Amino acid sequence: GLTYRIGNGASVPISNTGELIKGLRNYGPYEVPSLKYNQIALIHNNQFSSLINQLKSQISSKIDEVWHIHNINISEFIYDSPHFDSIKSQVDNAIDTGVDGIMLVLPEYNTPLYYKLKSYLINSIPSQFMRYDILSNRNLTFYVDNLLVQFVSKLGGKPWILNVDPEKGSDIIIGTGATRIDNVNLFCFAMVFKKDGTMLWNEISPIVTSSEYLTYLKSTIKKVVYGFKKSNPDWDVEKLTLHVSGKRPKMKDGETKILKETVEELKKQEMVSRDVKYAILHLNETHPFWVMHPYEGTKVKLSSKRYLLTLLQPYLMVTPIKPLSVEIVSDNWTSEEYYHNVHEILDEIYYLSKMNWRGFRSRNLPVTVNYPKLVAGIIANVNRYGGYPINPEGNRSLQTNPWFL
Amino acid sequence: GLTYRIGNGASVPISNTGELIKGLRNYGPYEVPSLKYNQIALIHNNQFSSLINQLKSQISSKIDEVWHIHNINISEFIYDSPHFDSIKSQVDNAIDTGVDGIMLVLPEYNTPLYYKLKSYLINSIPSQFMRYDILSNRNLTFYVDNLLVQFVSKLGGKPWILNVDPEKGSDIIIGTGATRIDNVNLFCFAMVFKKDGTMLWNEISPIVTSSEYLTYLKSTIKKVVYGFKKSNPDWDVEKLTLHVSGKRPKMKDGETKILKETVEELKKQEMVSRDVKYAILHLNETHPFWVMHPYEGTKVKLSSKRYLLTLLQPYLMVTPIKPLSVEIVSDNWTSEEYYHNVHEILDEIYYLSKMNWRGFRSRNLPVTVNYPKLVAGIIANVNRYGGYPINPEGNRSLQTNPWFL
DNA sequence: ATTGTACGTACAAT
DNA sequence: ATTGTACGTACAAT
DNA sequence: ATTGTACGTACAAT
DNA sequence: ATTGTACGTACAAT
Ligand SMILES: [Cl-]
Ligand SMILES: [Cl-]
Ligand SMILES: [Mg+2]
Ligand SMILES: [Mg+2]
Numbered sequence: 069g070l071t072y073r074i075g076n077g078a079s080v081p082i083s084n085t086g087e088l089i090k091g092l093r094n095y096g097p098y099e100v101p102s103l104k105y106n107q108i109a110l111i112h113n114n115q116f117s118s119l120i121n122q123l124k125s126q127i128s129s130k131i132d133e134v135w136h137i138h139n140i141n142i143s144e145f146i147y148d149s150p151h152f153d154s155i156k157s158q159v160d161n162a163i164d165t166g167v168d169g170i171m172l173v174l175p176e177y178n179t180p181l182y183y184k185l186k187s188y189l190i191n192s193i194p195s196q197f198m199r200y201d202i203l204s205n206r207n208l209t210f211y212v213d214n215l216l217v218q219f220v221s222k223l224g225g226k227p228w229i230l231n232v233d234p235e236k237g238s239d240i241i242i243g244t245g246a247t248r249i250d251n252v253n254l255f256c257f258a259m260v261f262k263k264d265g266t267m268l269w270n271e272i273s274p275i276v277t278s279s280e281y282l283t284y285l286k287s288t289i290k291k292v293v294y295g296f297k298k299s300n301p302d303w304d305v306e307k308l309t310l311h312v313s314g315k316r317p318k319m320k321d322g323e324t325k326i327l328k329e330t331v332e333e334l335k336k337q338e339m340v341s342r343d344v345k346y347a348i349l350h351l352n353e354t355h356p357f358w359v360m361h362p363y364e365g366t367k368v369k370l371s372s373k374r375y376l377l378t379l380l381q382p383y384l385m386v387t388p389i390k391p392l393s394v395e396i397v398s399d400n401w402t403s404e405e406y407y408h409n410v411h412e413i414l415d416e417i418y419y420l421s422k423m424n425w426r427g428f429r430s431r432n433l434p435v436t437v438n439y440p441k442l443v444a445g446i447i448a449n450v451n452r453y454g455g456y457p458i459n460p461e462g463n464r465s466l467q468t469n470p471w472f473l
Numbered sequence: 474g475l476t477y478r479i480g481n482g483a484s485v486p487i488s489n490t491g492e493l494i495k496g497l498r499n500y501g502p503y504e505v506p507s508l509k510y511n512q513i514a515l516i517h518n519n520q521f522s523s524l525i526n527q528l529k530s531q532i533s534s535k536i537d538e539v540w541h542i543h544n545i546n547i548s549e550f551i552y553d554s555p556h557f558d559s560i561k562s563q564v565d566n567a568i569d570t571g572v573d574g575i576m577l578v579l580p581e582y583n584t585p586l587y588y589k590l591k592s593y594l595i596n597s598i599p600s601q602f603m604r605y606d607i608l609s610n611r612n613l614t615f616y617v618d619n620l621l622v623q624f625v626s627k628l629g630g631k632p633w634i635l636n637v638d639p640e641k642g643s644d645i646i647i648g649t650g651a652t653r654i655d656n657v658n659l660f661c662f663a664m665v666f667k668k669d670g671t672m673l674w675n676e677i678s679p680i681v682t683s684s685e686y687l688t689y690l691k692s693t694i695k696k697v698v699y700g701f702k703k704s705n706p707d708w709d710v711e712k713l714t715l716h717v718s719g720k721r722p723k724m725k726d727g728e729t730k731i732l733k734e735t736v737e738e739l740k741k742q743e744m745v746s747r748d749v750k751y752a753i754l755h756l757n758e759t760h761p762f763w764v765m766h767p768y769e770g771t772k773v774k775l776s777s778k779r780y781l782l783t784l785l786q787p788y789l790m791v792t793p794i795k796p797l798s799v800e801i802v803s804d805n806w807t808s809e810e811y812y813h814n815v816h817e818i819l820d821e822i823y824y825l826s827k828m829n830w831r832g833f834r835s836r837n838l839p840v841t842v843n844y845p846k847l848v849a850g851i852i853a854n855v856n857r858y859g860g861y862p863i864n865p866e867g868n869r870s871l872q873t874n875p876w877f878l
Numbered sequence: 879a880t881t882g883t884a885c886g887t888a889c890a891a892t
Numbered sequence: 893a894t895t896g897t898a899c900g901t902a903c904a905a906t
Numbered sequence: 907a908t909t910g911t912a913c914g915t916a917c918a919a920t
Numbered sequence: 921a922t923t924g925t926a927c928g929t930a931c932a933a934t
Contacts, residue, residue: 172879174879177879198879203880214880214881215880427880427881428881431882
């Protein structure tokens with residue numbers, strides 16, 4: 069069945085972390101990140117610690133041997149006290165020396181300090197946080213293994229992509245919708261993906277009130293298609309799918325009407341093909357249930373437009389299911405192609421549920437739903453603890469890299 | 474897996490009508506009905522019709538050769554006009570000669586006449602109706618084949634029973650609840666079954682208003698247990714299950730409270746064992762869905778007390794499911810036996826979904842739910858068109874035979 | 879904040 | 893009393 | 907009323 | 921326009 073494509077034309081089976089890691093060592097990742105300085109800063113307050121030295125050695129050898137990123141040096145920067153100003157001084161010191169990314173070790177749980185520093189770094193340079201007190205109580209091998217998956221991704225590398233039939237499925241999938249941060253405030257999102265699970269462009273709205281939802285939903289989607297088209301100017305999108313998700317205002321028929329208008333305007337502006345075939349889907353995580361591989365990829369039809377994908381819960385009697393409801397709220401398909409297109413979009417959602425660059429283990433949740441949830445967590449908490457605002461507009465690094473992992 | 478037990482200790486696979494019919498011819502039914510007169514009346518208004526003669530010959534030879542009911546003679550009675558009084562004269566003439574049952578051919582669709590005659594016959598003698606205009610447009614072989622399944626059952630025979638492990642499942646299952654006949658009026662029902670799918674006793678309430686529901690629900694259940702116990706005086710019920718169904722007043726917590734009281738009173742009166750283990754289940758047919766034998770008998774857990782059985786739709790791309798929701802609203806099981814008992818009651822419901830004496834083909838709906846629906850259809854329409862009331866109390870034939878098929 | 883489970887013991891609601 | 897959460901700690905993952 | 911499907915064409919609701 | 925019913929006729933079942 070489905071496989072992951074890594075480097076040198078090799079592919080490895082899904083649902084098998086051991087073979088994925090082994091394949092990376094043999095063949096490299098799908099794309100090794102391009103770096104300016106070949107330099108990574110490690111920033112901590114545990115100078116001469118043995119654990120810091122063990123961590124640095126594993127990072128160094130695995131960046132070389134697993135990720136095939138050669139000639140990297142790691143520089144150390146020591147902050148004197150675990151507070152914002154003292155750590156920020158060392159972050160700025162690291163940036164001044166010329167580094168491709170920062171790995172920042174914090175001593176303990178500290179939510180305001182974390183989100184203030186994280187929002188500063190997201191606006192500055194690819195970064196990876198670590199907790200020393202958790203690091204001290206973990207298998208270092210597993211810790212660094214998965215750590216490097218998302219750090220390499222943050223640096224712009226592509227660890228692996230989905231091996232999918234290039235003749236089936238959408239040209240692009242737009243994950244879009246909004247996420248509430250409280251009873252009144254929200255932000256809209258729109259993320260463009262290839263059918264192989266790679267993210268091409270990201271846009272998010274400013275935080276606004278629910279009264280402004282549909283205005284900013286349309287504008288955020290137009291902005292992400294503009295950015296996708298400018299960065300991919302020869303791509304003619306003839307097969308388009310919207311994956312709408314997020315806890316958002318209940319305005320279903322008004323929202324569908326606006327999403328349809330948006331697609332039509334983008335056709336008018338020739339941002340997608342004038343003959344584009346599209347569908348607008350609602351993706352909702354529903355209540356889990358338990359059957360007391362027969363359901364790996366099973367598709368359930370509830371009505372002509374409501375479907376259910378029985379995604380397996382990652383777990384260690386009963387088989388747990390994490391179902392995903394998929395409703396077709398709008399499409400321009402003909403009756404003759406309709407159920408062929410239903411199978412294709414459902415298979416596509418299943419494939420995308422296997423993409424996750426946070427770590428080696430699949431999340432079994434489509435990236436079009438999962439990655440906005442990660443973004444929501446950061447935007448909400450940066451707002452709550454008053455960090456630096458994150459505005460990907462005008463910042464190509466934020467528009468194209470998975471800074472939210 | 475599951476098999477049907479027929480005569481002479483033989484058993485045949487489920488879901489295979491051809492082998493079931495062949496097994497009956499070779500081994501006979503599980504129980505051949507006992508008859509007083511060895512005489513069946515055929516009552517029609519098509520004297521000397523060739524089709525009537527073909528029908529009579531198939532009935533005669535199959536009663537002999539498939540059902541192993543020997544030495545039967547069929548007498549004919551001719552009514553002159555298709556009206557109640559003229560047909561009733563021939564029904565009474567048939568009864569006066571001494572017959573074990575009546576087969577009554579009506580010329581066409583006529584709902585008032587059908588239910589007036591049917592309610593008269595149900596109060597008199599086992600009976601089987603037929604429509605001449607439909608009979609003329611059918612494969613006579615298939616028509617008579619299934620016709621005789623339910624006629625033999627109405628005469629008190631047992632065509633086949635479920636082959637079930639005698640050490641698993643309930644001692645008796647009581648199908649109970651109520652069915653609305655309009656927005657205000659209803660009747661309660663209670664049917665006692667063995668785990669092999671045979672009905673032991675039946676009681677129904679008079680038609681009452683919804684305000685009287687819980688009073689008559691309790692009294693109808695007590696009445697059916699009294700009748701089961703009087704007819705089965707050495708049976709010690711230590712494993713009891715209630716299957717509650719029917720479109721009825723929304724009084725869930727009050728209904729559960731009364732059903733629990735009923736079981737406790739019956740324990741007090743020593744109608745069941747004082748150490749009886751029981752569960753009270755709600756069985757609801759839910760919305761069908763389609764998977765786009767992997768679900769023959771599949772059990773889904775939704776919560777600790779809510780389950781789903783994915784019963785297959787009988788049908789001729791997508792696999793249709795007719796799910797059955799099963800909720801445990803009350804039980805006296807211990808925590809240690811609980812999930813063992815959940816599997817047993819769910820398997821038991823699945824087995825009972827294979828019992829259907831209306832014809833050879835399974836209905837894939839548990840008899841504890843299906844047979845009350847058949848009763849509801851008759852009671853409602855006899856009320857609507859003012860036929861003779863059907864009161865099984867005091868009438869052992871109505872309390873023990875499946876007159877509703 | 880590598881991430882995710884699994885599972886005690888609490889306490890929340892009815 | 894009973895049933896869903898809730899919040900810790902434990903620790904698995906290749 | 908042997909029963910049950912499957913499926914046109916209508917019309918019902920939005 | 922679009923999507924669920926609805927009510928006929930057709931006819932399958934072994
Ligand atoms: Cl569970
Ligand atoms: Cl369908
Ligand atoms: Mg991260
Ligand atoms: Mg019948």
